[PDB]
Design a binder for this molecule. Structure first.
Ligand SMILES: Nc1ncnc2c1ncn2[C@@H]1O[C@H](COP(=O)(O)OP(=O)(O)NP(=O)(O)O)[C@@H](O)[C@H]1O
Length: 283
């Protein structure tokens, strides 16, 4: 059973309850669909002077089929340091990712190989499945959510939160069940995974119209040519991910069939998880 768990309070192990007067607004890190993400400096305690990202929502919940904030911790998922509420607003204090997003870093290279992309998709698959083993669905997977740390490793900017902006959803990566509105599943995550792999590999989106409606009819119905310049294993993985019907889609029966795909044959997953696999690029 899906159980939503509201996010009202969270103090990272060993630390004390935080509040807005312990932080220092410095800069606007970016703008996301649910409002701005800020840069703050903590002025207090063992981590006084530490830089964090801060998200300011009206409310947020975590829908989990079946501490959940301590179990979501992952090498490639942004870490929650503090969560609190003041004056009708929920504050989210998280890791400051200094790498920028992946797509930009890719744009600062004249070219890259399928290997380079493969690194990112491998780490990403690890994080996604880590959320899936916990009954969490990422729901909104996009490039703006995939950033890099200081080394070049992947870090997702959220972890399946159901959120609500305070100042009173990306169709391009929606699976056809989500456009038809039959609910987010982990298989939908894998569809979006496939769209991210397609864009990172061709520099183009598979489906995109003049409006959001056209993009939806395209996702549901349009033809999609297979880019011939792709390796047999990349084309294989892609066509295995682009199943309009979930449970027919790869990944709907675990991540294991994904990790064992020919495309990822030269990837040691234990070394990847332990971040002993060097990034293609330093940010
Ligand atoms: N921890 C972080 N460190 C550095 N930059 C971040 C961090 N979190 C978000 N950003 C930047 O702020 C922007 C918003 O990211 P995001 O976390 O998607 O905001 P959001 O609106 O809460 N999520 P969504 O509504 O799904 O887009 C992104 O373009 C990131 O570059």
């Amino acid at each position: 059973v899906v159980k939503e768990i509201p996010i009202t309070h969270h103090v990272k192990e060993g630390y004390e309850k935080a509040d807005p007067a312990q932080f220092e607004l410095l800069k606007v890190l970016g703008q996301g669909s649910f409002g701005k993400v800020f840069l703050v400096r903590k002025k207090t305690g063992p981590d006084a002077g530490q830089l964090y990202a801060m998200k300011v929502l009206k409310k947020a919940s975590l829908k989990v089929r079946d501490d959940i904030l301590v179990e979501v911790n992952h090498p490639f998922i942004v870490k929650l340091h503090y969560a609190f509420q003041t004056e009708g607003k929920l504050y989210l204090i998280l890791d400051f990712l200094r790498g920028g997003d992946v797509f930009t870093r890719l744009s600062k290279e004249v070219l890259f190989t399928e290997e380079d992309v493969k690194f990112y998709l491998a780490e990403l698959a690890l994080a996604l499945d880590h959320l899936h083993q916990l009954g969490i669905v990422y729901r909104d997977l996009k490039p703006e959510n995939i950033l890099l740390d200081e080394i070049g490793h992947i870090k997702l900017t959220d972890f399946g939160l159901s959120k609500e902006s305070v100042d009173q959803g990306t169709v391009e990566y929606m699976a056809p069940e989500v456009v038809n509105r039959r609910g987010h599943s982990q298989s939908a995550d894998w569809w979006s995974y496939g769209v991210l792999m397609f864009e990172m590999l061709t520099g183009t989106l598979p489906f995109q119209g003049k409006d959001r409606n056209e993009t939806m009819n395209m996702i549901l119905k349009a033809k999609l040519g297979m880019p011939q310049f792709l390796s047999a294993e990349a084309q294989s993985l892609l066509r295995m991910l682009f199943k309009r019907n979930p449970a027919n889609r790869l990944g709907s029966e675990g991540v294991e069939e994904i990790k064992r795909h020919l495309f990822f044959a030269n990837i040691d997953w234990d070394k990847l998880y332990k971040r002993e696999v060097q990034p293609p690029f330093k940010p």
